[PDB]
Symmetry: C3
Subunit: 183 residues, 3 copies
């Protein structure tokens, strides 16, 4: 079982500001010691669905958190819903919730939890995606590994933008990255 | 499919037609890593309209498009910009001795990236990258890759190259870019 | 044998300006005829540790070279130490030094040695990483394949920056790329 994913449909699966306000599409493919990751976001309703920074000058970022336990199982305080995250079966998920996915977790030696030791930047990957596929509508996607509390592992996606957008729907192009696997 | 590589071969022999016949070498390597295809791409334009860019004399020459069209079996169609002759599964630094029949597991996922319809068109079927002409850090061009948006095909991968700098007699040959996409199977 | 790496610890393994002044974290994972590569750099000491271009306007770039022989073994004139460059075992290396790694080497037809033939740019990958994980502290990472001499293969990482940084520590976010393997 080599791919954990959200199913690539458009059905809301994620809660940023209000219940099921978004569809996160995330595909994690195990290539041995690295996980190959592909992500995009469609916000379907609520506060982040249409950005207007004339109306709301300070609405410039938000975060989606995936929190995992010692067995790599998604925790319910995650923004992504548990029902929607599983190993691939065809164009869907297997019908039964998985019990172990440690091989897909971000490596804790590469990406340690917060402590009193010096924090290094290598637990971050920066990328840029484009709202509505327009090259003049960039938004930064910052991905951080294992920096959340209340979990053994975490992947967080912070979305932010510096431009003053006026009535721009928040739905994105796709971005690929990788990270070092725990096992 | 499992873990194979579909590619253009890594030589520099023109295999592609943008403005005139065989004016370019598209180097494209698609490697299957389960439910994702790891893609690596670069371009050398060797002749014709897009070979030497001068936006002082020709300010409107700012973009061009290379289309790969596929049938239900993932076989490349003759009318793509990329020639069929050397697009095949890898064997050594060349290709297998049979033109391939089946590569559906190298195709862009149709649920992820639907064909045009009157349903809402979402941006996730696009990946943006930036490559550099001549390997110079001050000569960016944008490579926009779009999945399954062409007609007359079951699947498609389309590369649009564009630039906003005013280049003066700059040869369009590029650094390499890597992306991935969700596989059909 | 699918992963050649530096280990994910933070122990210095690399000499930029002085002995073991840095940790290059480099993970090469063989996904058939493409190598999936993940890299970051922490500078701990020396000339490139704390960048101050008010004080030292000329300090704008440096290079880290990995040079390989015909069997894909790291030559000791590389900036990276041979001591911990090996195939993966857990969060560590295999017990004995590897003797063949040609399947991890950059392809010589794709990325030829310098010659009289026209030099093409496809043997370069550009990326941007962020010092200290700050989005306003970019530095460019330029990776070049097989352009060094006195070797069968090479991978070189050039780091440079255009901003006038005042007391900014050179430690980076992570970047992923790929390249065509020799076999
Ligand atoms: C890959 O797409 C981009 O790099 N978009 C940048 C964009 C683009 O270069 C320009 O608008 C020409 O169409 O310039 C930008 O300054 C912009 O905001 O438009 C930054 C984008 O990331
Ligand atoms: C990865 O390489 C780049 O980001 N190159 C940018 C380049 C570079 O920072 C500068 O010329 C100093 O060398 O700045 C640019 O504004 C430029 O066109 O020079 C955009 C390039 O994408
Ligand atoms: C992925 O991060 C970036 O694209 N950082 C750019 C950064 C950023 O957009 C801005 O400072 C707001 O955070 O603007 C920059 O002009 C900068 O140097 O700050 C270039 C960075 O590559
Ligand atoms: Zn709406
Ligand atoms: Zn030329
Ligand atoms: Zn330090």
């Amino acid at each position: 079982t080599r791919t954990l994913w959200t199913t690539p449909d458009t059905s809301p699966n994620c809660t940023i500001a209000q219940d099921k306000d978004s569809k996160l599409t995330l595909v994690l493919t195990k290539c041995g010691s690295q996980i190959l990751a592909n992500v995009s976001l469609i916000v379907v309703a609520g506060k982040y669905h249409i950005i207007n920074n004339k109306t709301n000058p300070k609405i410039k970022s938000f975060t989606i958190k995936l929190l995992f336990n010692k067995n790599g199982v998604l925790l319910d305080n995650s923004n992504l819903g548990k029902a929607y995250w599983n190993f691939r079966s065809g164009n869907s998920n297997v019908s039964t919730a998985y019990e172990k996915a440690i091989g897909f977790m971000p490596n804790l030696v590469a990406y340690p939890k917060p402590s009193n030791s010096k924090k290094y930047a290598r637990d971050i990957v920066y990328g840029t995606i484009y709202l509505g596929g327009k090259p003049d509508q960039p938004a930064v996607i910052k991905t951080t590994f294992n920096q959340e509390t209340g979990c053994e592992y975490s992947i967080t996606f912070n979305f932010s933008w510096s431009k003053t957008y006026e009535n721009v729907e928040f739905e994105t192009t796709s971005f690929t990255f990788s990270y070092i696997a725990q096992e």
